[PDB]
Amino acid sequence: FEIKKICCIGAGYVGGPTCSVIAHMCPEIRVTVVDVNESRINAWNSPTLPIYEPGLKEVVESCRGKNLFFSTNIDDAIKEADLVFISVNTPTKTYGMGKGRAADLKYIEACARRIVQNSNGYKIVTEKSTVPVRAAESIRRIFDANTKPNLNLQVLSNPEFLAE
Amino acid sequence: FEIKKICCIGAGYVGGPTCSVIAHMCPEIRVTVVDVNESRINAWNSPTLPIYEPGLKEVVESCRGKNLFFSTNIDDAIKEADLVFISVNTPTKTYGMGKGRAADLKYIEACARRIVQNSNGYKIVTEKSTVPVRAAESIRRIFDANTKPNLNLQVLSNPEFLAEGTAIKDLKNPDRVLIGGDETPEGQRAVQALCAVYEHWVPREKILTTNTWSSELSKLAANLFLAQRISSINSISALCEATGADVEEVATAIGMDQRIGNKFLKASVGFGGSCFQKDVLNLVYLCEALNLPEVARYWQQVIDMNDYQRRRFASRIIDSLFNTVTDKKIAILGFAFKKDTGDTRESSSIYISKYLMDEGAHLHIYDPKVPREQIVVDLSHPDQVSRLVTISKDPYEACDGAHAVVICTEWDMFKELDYERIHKKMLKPAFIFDGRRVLDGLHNELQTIGFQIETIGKK
Amino acid sequence: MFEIKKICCIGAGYVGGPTCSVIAHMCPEIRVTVVDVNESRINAWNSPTLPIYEPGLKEVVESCRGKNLFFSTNIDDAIKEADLVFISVNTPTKTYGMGKGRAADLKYIEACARRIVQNSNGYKIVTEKSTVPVRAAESIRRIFDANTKPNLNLQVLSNPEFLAEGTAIKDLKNPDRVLIGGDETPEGQRAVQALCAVYEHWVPREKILTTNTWSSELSKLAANLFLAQRISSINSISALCEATGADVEEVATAIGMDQRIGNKFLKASVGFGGSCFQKDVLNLVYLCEALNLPEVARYWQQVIDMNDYQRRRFASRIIDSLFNTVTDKKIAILGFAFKKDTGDTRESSSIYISKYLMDEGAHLHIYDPKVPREQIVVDLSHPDDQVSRLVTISKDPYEACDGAHAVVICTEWDMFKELDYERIHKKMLKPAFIFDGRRVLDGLHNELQTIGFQIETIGKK
Ligand SMILES: O=c1ccn([C@@H]2O[C@H](COP(=O)(O)OP(=O)(O)O[C@H]3OC[C@@H](O)[C@H](O)[C@H]3O)[C@@H](O)[C@H]2O)c(=O)[nH]1
Ligand SMILES: O=c1ccn([C@@H]2O[C@H](COP(=O)(O)OP(=O)(O)O[C@H]3OC[C@@H](O)[C@H](O)[C@H]3O)[C@@H](O)[C@H]2O)c(=O)[nH]1
Ligand SMILES: O=c1ccn([C@@H]2O[C@H](COP(=O)(O)OP(=O)(O)O[C@H]3OC[C@@H](O)[C@H](O)[C@H]3O)[C@@H](O)[C@H]2O)c(=O)[nH]1
Ligand SMILES: O=c1ccn([C@@H]2O[C@H](COP(=O)(O)OP(=O)(O)O[C@H]3OC[C@@H](O)[C@H](O)[C@H]3O)[C@@H](O)[C@H]2O)c(=O)[nH]1
Ligand SMILES: O=c1ccn([C@@H]2O[C@H](COP(=O)(O)OP(=O)(O)O[C@H]3OC[C@@H](O)[C@H](O)[C@H]3O)[C@@H](O)[C@H]2O)c(=O)[nH]1
Ligand SMILES: O=c1ccn([C@@H]2O[C@H](COP(=O)(O)OP(=O)(O)O[C@H]3OC[C@@H](O)[C@H](O)[C@H]3O)[C@@H](O)[C@H]2O)c(=O)[nH]1
Ligand SMILES: [Cl-]
Ligand SMILES: [Cl-]
Structure with a gap:
């Protein structure tokens, strides 16, 4: 199996620069970064990136429009991708059990369900973050319970060691 | 002396059914049930009774208007009665000394004062309730201080052992009748007159008499x-x-010991009802006045364990949903504290709901007999209810698009639901949290459908 | 699939002894051998005077001993010959280390398991039988799994014993239910059914419960x-x-008439004794520590705390009635067994009440119709100088009451209600007290008060 299309749910400090380098180093792979914040997505396609990272401006503009793309169309990007990165934020719970300490997995859970909603065939789903707290288990429990014919989703863990 | 006219202050779960069975068994005794709640009295005289009780409608309509009567005329019912029951509620004090533990005897004191105002001659005043906390003494103190010429009021104690949902069967065939009275010639005459009433359908050997x-x-x-x-x-x-054991199988081995007995060994989310928690709190407060701390902390554990059981069940629900329940639909099946009643007092369904509401869950509650207005008042503090709580008309609407189904009351209809239809419309993974062991024997069928069934006392 | 024809039981005490005697009496075609490391106890089983007092036990043993029921110190051979091996040894509480004073010491059960492996070839069923089985089956299975041999096939079953001392013969002949646990495998099913067939000689099938x-x-x-x-x-x-100002006996009568509660085990007392209950609570508490269930441990801990409180309150009422000074005062202690119709004194409330009185300097004169005198001395000498100065063992109740200030009834021996209390009162010091810790003198308070006693009983003014 060979990965030729990559989607990334989350265009923040992690998913943004990671996919920009992947697209820069893998020119034969189409890299599409998606995000729910349209203002952030527009900035990624603008001459003023939403985050300041030394050298990021040169890497993105070196392949944006060639094999690196930023879009708000989350559904179709997942539909075509062979590898789907999940690089969303997991805030700390503000109430309930674990208030102020436990992470809130509602965004990772929504990404897992939205992947099932727009996936057919074989796909590799990978969670990439700097603080992964039971993320792979949460994604796997959703995929095991929402199965389709000839639907084969794989769950990988690939933490990101980059420092801003 | 023959008791021929009975009046009962209090037309609730105790006084209402108790007087209905008395009038049913004693056709020659006039039984008048009075209450301050006019809408409740009107319901007693309507085809739709204010409380749900199996068999109560058939017993009421067989004698209502003949020798059973319901009225708000408390004064004349007292005046014409030979025997006066006091079956009102005693709420726990919400402030002052004993806040949250001590009972408030203001209603019992109010009844005793009103009885004296409308009484002449000889009457028997009998306190009947499930939690009689120093009731006969407080009634006695008022009678001894408000005396009229030729007014001779006798005070008796007659606790009611019935359980809601089975009140009719319990009243018709009680395990025993407990009657308390003074160890005097007058007290024994009063006790004997009350025994003559129960002897119309209760054998003598099952009538206990004491002080x-x-x-x-x-x-x-x-x-x-x-x-x-x-x-x-x-x-x-x-x-x-x-x-890794099953509490149902363990309870079977325990109950076969005839010294232990196989009754009241059904594990659940926690006991509820107006009787038990209050009774324990009154025991605790009583031991504080008597300086019995060792006795108090012994029985306190009955409440502490019940609260732990409730909290553990709610935590298993929250844990199964990735410790995040915000904007997740959860179905609550059953809101009464037990099956075959509409009463919600101290029901575990209230506490489990509040625990889920504090996590941001959207609750859809179904109960076949509990009215929707009662559920709203229970969950509301004396904002969250308007945002998170929906009252469903049928169980399949509450389970539509839900993450988990929570069974809190052992209604027999819950074991007859179409769970293949529920599973198709639920979000996956679909959880069933059996807090009453009602779906036992259906686990293999529920697992084949695709449910993640979690129950009490079993993994 | 397998039939038991020969039985060995390691442990000839209050559990193993009576249990095998009834089994041998009900199954004349099964050879039953009760073995024990205690030779003096084994010699007593083979004597006209059994080592334990149990009503009806003498008639059962003498009916089949020497025919199909045997007692011996030959543990190894009994094992070799046996189809089924019972393990009915005691498990004392650890006196040091992790779980000091709460956890069970499984060294004797482990020693039995290794001994079994040592003298076993082929197929045998090893069943653990005791009133307090604390993780006993797992410990036996772990030793068996690690010591395999060619053609050796040992099975491990659990079969708790529900008998109560004083009524063991009646309990064993007509049990409320039989509980047998075994692995949910073909091997375990064969072993369970084999043991069920033994009980089915006198126990109805509907009263035999099977599980793991x-x-x-x-x-x-x-x-x-x-x-x-x-x-x-x-x-x-x-x-x-x-x-x-109420009477607990009257309250207990009104409680017990609720068929959901039952009218059994509602007899207030100075406190429960015996080798089972206190030990069981402690074991549950320690088990909850390993399971991280402190709420469950806290809940059941109150059964012990209430029992210790009941004993202290009874001793305090005795000391209080004697001006809070009991130095050089003679006090009669009637009953030392933990219950009637037995000589067993394990965890008897009589020991605790005596030690509370000895701490006041009381001169105790103890009488019990079945407890041996040496056992009382050992119980009170447990960590004697204080026992030598204060304790006297009497041969009859009138001797223990002669010149006493108080009479303390700690065991419900029926003979205590038939004593000549006029004779006792004459030779007692005034005021003469009777402390009924068992409610055995109910209905006699009017007579005892007329004689001139001060009657203090549990659960009444
Ligand atoms: O459901 C969601 C949630 C989040 N997102 C997007 O994910 C992006 C996250 O941006 P952030 O700058 O917060 O993310 P980061 O890349 O810095 O992640 C880092 O910080 C937050 C931690 O919880 C993460 O584990 C860490 O990797 C946002 O643009 C948000 O719109 C979605 O597109 N969908
Ligand atoms: O010597 C130091 C280093 C760092 N710091 C402080 O520690 C904080 C973290 O600095 P980092 O450069 O590690 O910051 P980052 O959060 O970008 O990266 C960190 O989290 C994500 C992980 O993947 C990175 O490996 C980890 O370094 C900064 O506020 C920095 O000022 C010090 O105070 N002293
Ligand atoms: O002053 C008063 C107070 C109360 N009442 C009536 O007494 C009735 C009490 O009925 P409830 O259903 O509340 O009470 P129950 O019959 O269930 O009693 C039970 O629960 C409450 C406990 O405090 C009681 O001790 C117990 O018996 C009410 O209808 C109330 O209107 C009066 O008529 N006068
Ligand atoms: O085995 C059981 C029994 C009961 N319960 C729970 O305990 C609560 C009380 O149930 P009960 O049947 O006792 O109901 P009630 O409260 O009506 O009656 C109780 O209080 C009044 C007394 O006079 C009755 O004798 C007493 O049973 C219910 O929530 C029930 O679900 C269990 O959880 N398991
Ligand atoms: O290694 C050993 C240990 C013990 N034994 C014997 O096992 C017998 C134990 O009998 P006991 O009378 O002490 O005990 P019981 O039969 O009353 O058992 C009861 O009390 C003690 C608890 O720990 C047991 O769990 C309970 O069943 C003793 O006779 C002892 O000699 C052995 O033969 N070998
Ligand atoms: O109503 C009662 C019953 C018992 N007790 C006391 O509790 C203690 C235990 O009495 P039991 O008759 O249960 O005696 P045992 O210890 O022999 O049996 C107990 O432990 C072993 C288990 O197998 C038995 O099922 C259990 O009853 C005695 O000291 C007895 O006096 C009371 O104080 N009141
Ligand atoms: Cl909220
Ligand atoms: Cl001393």
């Missing part, structure tokens, strides 16, 4: 022994969940 | 808790009755 205090203390102890059986088997259920 | 070994042990643990809790609950009520 008023020993009567109330026996009732209180009996309630403690009952609640303790539930908390003990619930503590075993936590032990079963942690070690 | 852990659920079996957990059920026995829970059953003993419920029984002990009933005693502590009614004893908590006896404290309320004393403080408010």
Whole structure:
């Protein structure tokens, strides 16, 4: 199996620069970064990136429009991708059990369900973050319970060691 | 002296059914049930009774208008009665000394004063309730201080042992009748007259007589022994969940010991109802006045364990949903504290709901007999309810698009639901949290459908 | 699939002894051998005077001993020959180390398991039988799994014993239910059914419960808790009755008529004794520590705390009635066994009440119709100088009461209600006190008061 299309749910400090380098180093792979914040997505396609990272401006503009793309169309990007990165934020719970300490997995859970909603065939789903707290288990429990014919989703863990 | 006219102040779960069965068994006795709640009295005289009780409608309509009557005319009912029952509620004090533990005897004191105002001659005043906390004494203090010429009021204690949902069967065939009275010629005459009423359908060997205090203390102890059986088997259920056993199979081995008995050994989310928790709190407060801290902390554990059982069940629900429940639909099946009643007082369904509401869950509650207005008042503080709580018309609307189904009341209809239809419309993974062991024997079918079934005392 | 024709039981005590005697009496075609490391106890089983007092036990043993029932110190051979091996040894509480004073010491059960492996070839069924099975089956299975041999096939079953001392013969002949635990495998099913066939000689099939070994042990643990809790609950009520002017016996009658509660085990007392209940609560508490269940441990801990409180309150009432000074005062202690119709004194409330009185300097004169005199000395000498100065063992109740200030009844021996209390009162010092810790003198208070006694009983003013 060979990965030729990559989607990334989350265009923040992690998913943004990671996919920009992947697209820069893998020119034969189409890299599409998606995000729910349209203002952030527009900035990624603008001459003023939403985050300041030394050298990021040169890497993105070196392949944006060639094999690196930023879009708000989350559904179709997942539909075509062979590898789907999940690089969303997991805030700390503000109430309930674990208030102020436990992470809130509602965004990772929504990404897992939205992947099932727009996936057919074989796909590799990978969670990439700097603080992964039971993320792979949460994604796997959703995929095991929402199965389709000839639907084969794989769950990988690939933490990101980059420092801003 | 023959008791021929009975009046009962209080047309609730105790006084209402009790007087209906008395009038049913004693056709020659006029029984008048009075209450301050006019809408409740009107319901008693309507085809739709204010409380749901199996068989109560058939018993009421067989004698209502003949020798059973319901009225708001408290004064004349007292004046014409030979026997006066006091079956009102005593709420726990919300402030002052004993806040949250002590009972408030203002209603019983108010009844005793109103009885004196409308009484002449000889009457028998009998306190009848499930939690008689120093009731006969307080009635006696008022009568002894408000005397009229030729006014001779006798004070008796007659605790009611019925359980809601089975009140009719309990009243018709009680295990025993407990009557307390003074150890005087007058007290024994009063006690004997009350025994003659029960002898119309209760055998003599099942009628116990004692003094008023020993009567109330026996009732209180009996309630403690009952609640303790539930908390003990619930503590075993936590032990079963942690070690791989089934509390239902363990309760079977325990109950076959005839010294223990096989009753009241059903593990659950926690006991509820107006009797047991209050009874334990009154025991605790009583021991504070008597300086019996060792006795108080002994029985306090019955409440502490019941609260732990409730909290553990709610935590298993929250844990199964990735510790995040915000904007997740959850179905609550059953809101009464037990099946075959509409009463919600101290129901575990209230506490489980509040625990889920504090996590941001959108609750859809169904109960076949509990009215929707009662559920709203229970969940509302004396904002969250308007945002998170929906009252469903049928179980399949509450389970539509839900993450988990939570069974809190052992309604027999819940084991007859179309769970293939529920599973198709639920979000996956679909959880069933059986807090009453009602879906036992259906687990293999529920697992084949695709459910993640979690129950008490079993993994 | 397998039939038991020969039985060995390691442990010839209050559990193993009577149990095998009834089994041998009900199954004349099965050879039953009771073995024990204690030779003096084994010699007593083969004598006209049995080592334990149990009503009806003498008639059962003498009916089949020497025919199909045997007692011996030859543990190894008994094992070799046996189809089925019972393990009915004691498990004392650890006196040091992790779980000091709470956890069970499984060294004897482990030693039995290794001994079994040593003398076993082929197929045998090893069944653990005791009133307090604390993780016993798992410990035996772990030793068997690690010591395999060619053609060796040992099975491990759990079979808790529900008998109560004083009524063991009646309990064993007509049990409320038989509990047998075994692995949910073909091997375990064969072993369970084989043991069921033994009980089916006199126990109806509908009273034989089968499950796995852990659920079996957990059920026995829970059953003993419920029984002990009933005693502590009614004893908590006896404290309320004393403080408010009621009688616990009357309250207990009104409680017991509720068929959901039952009228058994509602007899208030000075406190429960015996080798099972206290031990069971402690084992549950320690088990909850390993399972991280402190709420469950806290809940059942109150059964012990209430029992210790009931004893202290009874001793305090005795000391209080004697001007809070009992130095050089003679006090009669009637009854030292933990219950009537037995000589067993394990955890008897009589020991605790005596030690509270000895701490006041009381001169105790103890009488019990079945407890041997040496056992009382050992019980009170447990860590004697204080026993030598204060303790006297009497041969009759009138000797123990001669010149005493108080009479303390700690055991419900029926003979205590037939004593000549006029003779006792004449030779007692005034005021003469009778402390009924068992309610055995109910109905006699009018007579005893007329004679001139001060009657103080549990659960009444
Ligand atoms: O459901 C969601 C949630 C989040 N997102 C997007 O994910 C992006 C996250 O941006 P952030 O700058 O917060 O993310 P980061 O890349 O810095 O992640 C880092 O910080 C937050 C931690 O919880 C993460 O584990 C860490 O990797 C946002 O643009 C948000 O719109 C979605 O597109 N969908
Ligand atoms: O010597 C130091 C280093 C760092 N710091 C402080 O520690 C904080 C973290 O600095 P980092 O450069 O590690 O910051 P980052 O959060 O970008 O990266 C960190 O989290 C994500 C992980 O993947 C990175 O490996 C980890 O370094 C900064 O506020 C920095 O000022 C010090 O105070 N002293
Ligand atoms: O002053 C008063 C107070 C109360 N009442 C009536 O007494 C009735 C009490 O009925 P409830 O259903 O509340 O009470 P129950 O019959 O269930 O009693 C039970 O629960 C409450 C406990 O405090 C009681 O001790 C117990 O018996 C109410 O209808 C109330 O209107 C009066 O008529 N006058
Ligand atoms: O085995 C059981 C029994 C009961 N329960 C729970 O305990 C609560 C009380 O149930 P009960 O049937 O005792 O109901 P009630 O409260 O109506 O009656 C109780 O209080 C009044 C007394 O006079 C009755 O004798 C007593 O049973 C219910 O929530 C029930 O679900 C269990 O969880 N398990
Ligand atoms: O290694 C050993 C240990 C013990 N034994 C024997 O096992 C017998 C134990 O009998 P006991 O009378 O002490 O005990 P019981 O039969 O009353 O058992 C009861 O009390 C003690 C608890 O730990 C047991 O779990 C309970 O069943 C003793 O006779 C002892 O000699 C052995 O033969 N070998
Ligand atoms: O109503 C009662 C019953 C019992 N007790 C006391 O509780 C203690 C235990 O009495 P039991 O008759 O239960 O005696 P045992 O210890 O022999 O049996 C107990 O432990 C072993 C288990 O197998 C038995 O099922 C259990 O009853 C005695 O000291 C007895 O006096 C009371 O104080 N009141
Ligand atoms: Cl909220
Ligand atoms: Cl001393």
